[PDB]
Structures are given as C-alpha cells and as structure tokens.
Ligand binder design. Structure first.
Ligand code: 6LT
Ligand code: ZN
Lengths: 174, 260, 292
C-alpha cells in the first residue's frame, strides 16, 4: 500500500480536458488520459498529466499505444525526471470498462494508479478518487479489483500562490 | 512431436537434481527453439534461473507462473513460495523493490513462513537474529552463496538493511548499542556505518571520540510546520468522520446555525 | 454560459486573420486574458526551472482587441530555430488530434529575480516573431518575486515596430531592477508596451477550486515563508548595498536622486521580511499559546 500525494494542477488538467471535450462535441463525454510524477521509496507524488488518444471498437476502449509512446518521448524531452505513473478518467464508481482499460495500461507499467474524477457531484468533497489494482483468485479464476488509497495535497509555495490567485480572482498589510 | 521435448526436460531435471546445472541449462536453451512449436518448460526454466544465482528473474518467472489456473492450488502456492524466497535474497535494486511491492499486495503471501521477512523488508523494519535463523533453515543449499573468505551475502545484506532501518528510529546512537542491535562487534558496526556513509547510502556523520553516529538532524522550525500540518489534518479528519457518521443531528444543524 | 469562451470556431478565426485590423493600427491589442490552467502551468514550469530561465509557447486565439491564452507547453531548450521549431510543430501536430484546436498566440519565458520586462534580445525576438507570425505577445514571469510578495508577477508585452516613435504616454510602474540590468532596461523601454492582464476559468474549475479550499487551507496555515526564500533576501540586500554606495557617490559630487530608489528597494525588502515574521507570529499565537 503506497501513499499518494496529489497536485491541484492535475485536477485542473482533468477538468479542463472534460470541459473542452464537452463543449466541442456538444454533449458530456468521458475522457481518458495519463499521469506523470515521481516516486520516492513507497511514496508516490503525481505532478502533471497529458491527454491520451483512444478509440472505441464495438463497445470497448482501445488505447493507441503508438501515440502514447510518441507523447512519452515528447514529454521526456522536457521533464527528464518525471515518469509515467498511471491513467485517469471521468465518471462515477469504477466499472468493468475501467477494468479493461486498466488491464490494457498494465502492459506499459507494472503497477499503475487509477484516478477518477466525478464532474457531476452533489456532495461537498473533492470528487477525486485514487485506486490501485489488486489481483485475486475467485472460484479458481484470476480476476483483478480496485483498492482505494488515501491521497493528500502536495505543498508547493508557487502552486499555493497560483491556486489562491485563481480561486479568489479579485494598503499592503491589509 | 513431444517425446523428444519430454526426454530433454527429463534429462535436464535429472541433471539439475544431480547438481550439474551447466548441461541442464544448455539442454534447456537448445529445447527452447522447439518449445514454441507446440507448462513444465516454464518450471524447468525457472528452476534453471534459480540455480544460476539469478534470483530476480526466477522470482518474476515464478510469480507469473503462480497465476496459471491450469495448475493445482498447492503447486501455485509452491511457486509463490519460490518467488518470495528468490525476491528476499535477490540483489538490491529498483526491480527488487517493485517485486517486493507486488508480493506484499498479494493476499496469498500471508500463509507462508517467510511472509514476516517480506513485511520487514518492504516496510523497512529490523530483522532480528531468530527470523534470519529460521529463514536460513528453510533455504536450500544452493541459495546460500558465500565468498571463500566468508562474509555471507544474505547476512551482510540483512545487516545493511537493519542499519538503514535503525537510521529511521534513532536521532543518534553509540557504537556499543549499534553493535548490540545489529548483533555484531562494535568495531565492525563502526566500519560498516563508515562504509555505508562513504558510498552515500545514508546521511549522517561519525564522532569517534564520543563514539556516536548521528543521523538526520530534524531541525526545529520545519518540525513545527509539520506538526501544525498534522494537527490540522486531525481536525479535518475528525470533522469528516463526524459529518459522515451522523448527518442531520449536530452536523448539518450546527453548520446552518453557525452560518445563520 | 461562462463556458462559452471555451467554444472554438475556426471560420471566425479565419475571417479575422484574413481581415487583420492590427496591420493598420499599432496600439490595437490592449487586453490579455489568460486561462487559470495556463497560468498555473506557467507558474509551475517556471518554479521547476529553479534559478535558471525556462521558455515555452502559448496557444490561444484572438477576440476583437483581446488576446486569449488557453494552454501552454514547455520547449526543451536543453534554441531559437531548429530544435525549438521542430518541437513546436511536433507538439501542435500531436495535440491537434486530442481536442486542442487552437494554434500559437505567443511565447513565455521566466525572469527569475529581476522583474518582468523585455531585454534587448527579447525585444529583437518579439520584433522577429511579429514580423512573420501575427498576432503575438510575450509573457514574462518572475517565479521568485511571486513567492516573496505573495502575488503572481506576470506581464504580457507587445513590441512597437521599428521606426515608430510613440508620443510619451507611459505610466511605467516602479520595478526594482538589479544594478547590472539597469542599463539594459533603459535603452529598450520605449520599444514595447504592456497589455492589461486578466484571468478566467470555467464552471467546473470554479466548483473544483471551491471544493478544494475545504482542505487546502492547511497549507496556507503552515507556510512559514521566512525560510523558503533566504538567498533571495541576501541577494536583494547585496544589490541594495551597492545602490546605496552609488547614491553616496552621487551625494559626494555636486538615475536622478538614486537615494530615493535605494530607499524604495530597502523598504520593499524590509516590508517583505516583516510580513514573513508576522505570519509566524500569528501561527505562534494560534497553535503554541494554548498552553494547558
Ligand atoms: C520564441 C523563441 C523560441 N524564439 N523565437 C525566436 C525568433 F528567432 F523566431 C527567437 C526566440 C528566442 O529564443 N528568444 C530568446 C532570447 C533570449 C533568451 C535568453 C538568453 O538571452 C540567455 C538567458 C538570459 C535571458 C533573459 N531573457 C531571455 N534570456 C531566451 C531564453 C529564455 C528562457 C530560457 C532560455 C532561453 C530566448
Ligand atoms: Zn528575457
């Protein structure tokens, strides 16, 4: 069980991706992306996030791996220290489609995380939920399930100032 | 068709049981060319890799073969046992860390006698003498790789792990207590600590006259900030639990009343 | 319909580009609007750069007299032509098929510790860019003063064409430029003009930020800014002492009244220090003085 730290920039990236796709296509649509960051020992820290390209065949989502590797080389050109960590999507509780996509993603990295945002929520809590994949044996068959992890918010001074400026949006002691 | 492959596998396993691994590996490599033309081949390859002091590959192979549903439950547990044993005494690295994490996430690992050592290695705990004694008792003789002059690899790795894990409990420690906690002579404890600090494995320094090795300092003002953050985290979690275990009642009524 | 700014129509953009009004007037673009995500991306990239300079591009569109910036990406720069343009073209091609339809609208780069202004090289670069690809804008960020002052230091400038002499009309707010960059700020100060900068965000972004504040106040209450910037204050004190020496030399004889400028810099540094101290005093009153 790892301990995950989240950055508000990732949440802003996911929300902007959802808003852009919904406005462009005219109706709300689930988005699928990727996360990058840094892992120290057993502590994971998710820093940034880039969109991913996928297709729908029959009723299943297939992730374009060639585009993923192209974008991986592109971001490795700039952010040398950052590494692939997992994927994200928008929705409610995990569904078998998320299981299929996680099985697809696991071929890239051994133990990816799964972040899910809920854009249509009613409660007063942040709808970000972080899961990890756990393999299990049931009736002699090998399945996988999601175990939720508790996440925090990373502390960066410039990030805090920027998020504060965005949240407020309009003497010196005062 | 498969008679030749079966005979090759039988010869390889007989040679492996005869402690003659060179011919067994050669035969396995030769038969791997014809293997793809068509379960026991993976077992033989994992055993061969285990016999060649290549432990991380054997552990990975055993774990990936532990998920085969066409295999009995007992044999799957035995493969998990082999993977755990190869992981614990594998060379230190990032791949070993990922293997330890994968094994820790596995529930079936909780019914083995080496699970305690897996928990202690993954979570950075102190492994005492008796646990390592039982682990060496359950190990097979080819696993115990020792140099001619001595200095068992497993014992040295366990001592390094103990000293690193003791770096996270103590602000500073004397040589006598460090030698009593690693169960080694104090001079050897000083030598190991100095070697470990020199290569950059640890952060700390040694005061020889006082006989004290000092780990990370943990200054005052950053500690104050971290304690403030933890206290506010406690407040937030307590409010969350109160609000989610007892709605209406105090929670929302007092929230509104405070708002009003 | 706050989200209507996110809807992109290509026909209107082509019509505006083919009917360019900025080729007649010169003080045309006077408003810059930046998305919240783009601003945060620039701030994080500049902070991750460290004490060095980092540069990237700025995608967006135009709307009347407004330059709208939606996203950003970081150029490698370990390079003017070659590598930078290869990265720009490849990134635009990659991002065009995932939903990002806008094209480049500017370039941004950081000015760590010496304000937000355009040097001679930046003015030449902006002139070159506006000669060929128009419209364009240059955003300069000070990632170090942002932490010290608790305010986002950002400035969007646009460069006057060569041979054009505007008649005065410069407010020119005071900037504490270090001593070794005062001469560069003087020669090239009337070759560009600043655009007023505003920020915008969507509805989901607003809701998410409101829900995030319920748990993000802990980091505000445990900041302790007096330790995060201790070398910046030392550099400021060194520069202020040099400026004091120059003002004393001017006094012994006989900028204009360099003593006033040195006093202003000293006041700024001292006020930042006192703010950092009073934050810790408030924390001590709240948490440590509950002695039971
Ligand atoms: C949009 C960019 C890629 N660009 N296009 C064209 C044009 F030829 F097309 C030309 C350009 C272009 O590289 N400009 C430029 C000029 C100078 C610097 C550095 C330079 O002085 C040395 C550092 C000191 C400095 C302080 N302020 C700018 N600098 C940079 C630059 C900024 C940040 C990081 C790395 C480089 C970019
Ligand atoms: Zn510059």
């Amino acid at each position: 069980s790892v301990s995950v730290a989240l950055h508000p920039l990732v949440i802003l990236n996911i929300s902007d991706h959802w808003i852009r796709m919904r406005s462009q296509e005219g109706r709300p649509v689930q988005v699928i992306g990727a996360l990058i960051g840094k892992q120290e020992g057993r502590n994971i820290e998710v820093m940034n996030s880039f969109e991913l390209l996928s297709h729908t065949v029959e009723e299943k989502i297939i992730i374009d791996k060639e585009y993923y590797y192209t974008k991986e080389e592109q971001f490795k050109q700039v952010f040398k220290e950052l590494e692939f960590l997992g994927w994200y999507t928008t929705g409610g509780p995990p569904d078998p489609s998320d299981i299929h996509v996680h099985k697809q993603v696991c071929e890239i990295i051994e133990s990816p995380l799964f972040l899910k945002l809920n854009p249509m929520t009613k409660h007063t809590d942040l709808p970000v939920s972080v899961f990890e994949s756990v393999i299990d044996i049931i009736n002699g068959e090998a399945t996988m399930l999601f175990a939720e992890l508790t996440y925090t918010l990373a502390t960066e001074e410039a990030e805090r100032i920027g998020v504060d400026h965005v949240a407020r949006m309009t003497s010196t002691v005062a | 068709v498969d008679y030749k492959l079966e005979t090759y596998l039988k010869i390889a396993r007989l040679y492996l049981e005869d402690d003659d691994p060179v011919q067994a590996e050669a035969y396995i490599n030769r038969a791997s060319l014809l293997q793809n033309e068509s379960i026991h081949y993976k077992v033989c390859y994992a055993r061969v890799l285990d016999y060649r002091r290549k432990f991380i590959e054997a552990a990975q192979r055993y774990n990936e073969l532990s998920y085969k549903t066409i295999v009995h439950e007992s044999e799957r547990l035995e493969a998990l046992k082999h993977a755990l044993h190869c992981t614990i005494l594998a060379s230190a690295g990032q791949q070993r860390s990922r293997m330890l994490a994968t094994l820790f996430k596995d529930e079936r690992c909780q019914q083995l006698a080496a699970y305690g050592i897996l928990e202690k290695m993954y979570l950075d705990r102190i492994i005492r003498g008796n646990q390592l004694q039982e682990f060496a008792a359950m190990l097979m003789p080819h696993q115990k790789a020792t140099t001619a002059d001595g200095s068992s690899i497993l014992d040295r790795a366990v001592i390094e792990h103990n000293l690193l894990s003791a770096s996270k409990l103590y602000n500073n420690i004397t040589f006598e207590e460090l030698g009593a906690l690693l169960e080694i002579p104090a001079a050897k404890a000083e030598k190991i600590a100095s070697q470990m600090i020199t290569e950059g494995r640890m952060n700390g320094f040694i005061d020889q006259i006082d006989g004290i090795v000092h780990f990370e300092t943990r200054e005052a003002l950053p500690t104050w900030d971290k304690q403030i953050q933890s206290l506010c985290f406690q407040v937030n979690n307590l409010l969350e639990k109160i609000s989610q275990t007892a709605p209406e009642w105090t929670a929302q009524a007092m929230e509104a009343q405070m708002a009003q | 319909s706050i989200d209507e700014i996110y809807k992109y129509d290509k026909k209107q953009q082509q019509e505006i580009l083919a009917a360019k009004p900025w080729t007649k007037d010169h003080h045309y673009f006077k408003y810059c609007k930046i998305s919240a995500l783009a601003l945060l991306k620039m701030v994080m990239h500049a902070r991750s750069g460290g004490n060095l300079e980092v540069m990237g591009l700025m995608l967006g569109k135009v709307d009347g007299e407004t330059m709208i910036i939606m996203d950003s990406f970081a150029l490698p720069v370990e390079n003017a032509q070659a590598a930078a343009y290869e990265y720009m073209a490849a990134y635009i091609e990659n991002a065009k098929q995932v939903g990002r339809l806008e094209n480049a609208i500017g370039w941004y780069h950081s000015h760590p510790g010496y304000g937000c202004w355009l040097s001679g090289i930046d003015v030449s670069t902006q002139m070159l860019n506006q000669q060929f690809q128009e419209p364009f804008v240059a955003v300069v960020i000070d990632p170090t003063r942002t932490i010290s002052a608790g305010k986002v230091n950002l400035g969007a400038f646009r460069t006057y064409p060569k041979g054009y002499k505007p008649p005065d009309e410069g407010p020119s707010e005071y900037q504490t430029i270090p001593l070794n960059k005062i001469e560069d700020f003087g020669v090239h100060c009337k070759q560009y003009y600043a655009l007023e900068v505003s920020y915008f965000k969507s509805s989901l972004d607003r809701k998410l930020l409101e829900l995030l504040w319920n748990k993000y106040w802990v980091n505000t209450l445990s900041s302790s800014s007096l330790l995060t910037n201790a070398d910046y204050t030392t550099g400021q004190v060194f520069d202020l002492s040099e400026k004091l020496e120059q003002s004393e030399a001017q006094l012994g004889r006989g900028s204009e009244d360099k003593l006033a400028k040195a006093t202003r810099d000293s006041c700024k540094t001292t006020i930042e220090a006192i703010h950092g101290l009073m934050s810790q005093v408030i924390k001590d009153k709240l948490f440590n003085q509950i002695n039971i």
